[PDB]
Amino acid sequence: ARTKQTARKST
Amino acid sequence: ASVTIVKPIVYGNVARYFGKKREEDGHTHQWTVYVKPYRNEDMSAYVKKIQFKLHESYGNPLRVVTKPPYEITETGWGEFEIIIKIFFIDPNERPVTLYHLLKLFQSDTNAMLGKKTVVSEFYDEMIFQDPTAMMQQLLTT
């Protein structure tokens, strides 16, 4: 699986 | 992908101040770090376990939670980054990694609004593309 957000910066 | 399943989640922490520094260990706060579904579901249908890696100043810093609620409660004095890893019931489904700064100290902005806990939480989505038949069933139950 993958995530929508990057590791350490989020919308 | 023929099947795409998106599971929204919220992760982060809550923290509460003791009102004083404890003499024994210098701890000032109780905190709880967590991952939960955004919607009301039983995440354990498809999540095998969630691991939380704490700072080396903690005993047994690699913590494992195998059933909901996926949370760890501790006390402490300092903020630090926690690594969270979410494992699925199919071992070949790549685990999800999250990065969370454990927040203890409240903003003046929120203090002036009368907030008595610190909450630092983030919305994310776990995206499954063409998972196994077993995973598809459990993701959709």
Q: Where are the domains of chain B?
A: 1-140
Sign of the C-alpha dihedral, residues B120, B86, B98, B126? Answer: negative
Per DSSP, the three-state class of B126 is strand
How many angstroms separate the CA atoms of B99 and B83, rounded? 5
Nearest to A1 by CA among B122, B52, B9: B9
Position B107: which residue type? S
Nearest to B82 by CA among B112, B52, B43, B118: B52
Q: How many residues appear in chain A?
A: 11
Dig out the tokens for B50 from the structure.
């969630």
Q: How many residues appear in chain B?
A: 141
Terminal CA-CA length for chain B: 20
Breaks in chain B (C–N beyond 2.5 Å) sit after none
Residue contact A2–B95, C-beta within 8 A: no
Q: If residue B57 lies in a helix (H) or strand (E), which one and from where to where?
A: none
Position B17: which residue type? Y
Resolution (Å units): 1.5
Interface probe with B: pick from A3, A8, A9, A11, most Cβ of B within 10 Å: A3
Torsion angle of the four alpha carbons B62, B74, B78, B9, in this order, in degrees rounded to the nearest 10 = 70
Residues of B in contact with A10 (CB under 8 A): 122-124
Q: What are phi and psi of B32, to 5 degrees?
A: -135, 120
Confirm if A1 and B94 have CB atoms less than 8 A apart. yes
Residue contact A10–B122, C-beta within 8 A: yes
Strand order in the sheet with B62-65: B62-65, B47-53, B81-88, B96-101
Residue contact A1–B122, C-beta within 8 A: no
Q: Please count the CA atoms within 13 angstroms of the CA of B10 that sit on its side-chain side.
A: 12
Residues of B in contact with A2 (CB under 8 A): 94, 96, 126-127, 129
Confirm if B57 and B72 have CB atoms less than 8 A apart. no
Position B15: which residue type? A
Which experimental technique did the depositors report for determining this structure? Answer: X-ray
